[PDB]
Write a protein that binds this ligand. Structure first.
Ligand SMILES: [Zn+2]
Ligand SMILES: [Zn+2]
Length: 60
């Protein structure tokens, strides 16, 4: 007889990726703490567009 159903891969993938680029995120939206970015610079540029979904730290 033969038997041996072996083959299970555990899920593993950091939840830190720049929404804009995608490579890697270092910072995070200081308004909702959901949108990740590789740096404030990437946030400011992807902010005026992102904020269109989140409230934000300041309303102006
Ligand atoms: Zn980026
Ligand atoms: Zn946000």
């Amino acid at each position: 007889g033969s038997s041996g159903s072996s083959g299970i891969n555990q899920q593993e993938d950091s939840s830190e990726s720049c929404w804009n680029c995608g490579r890697k995120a270092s910072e995070t939206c200081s308004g909702c703490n959901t949108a990740r970015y590789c740096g404030s610079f990437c946030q400011h540029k992807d902010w005026e567009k992102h904020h269109h979904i989140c409230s934000g730290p300041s309303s102006g």
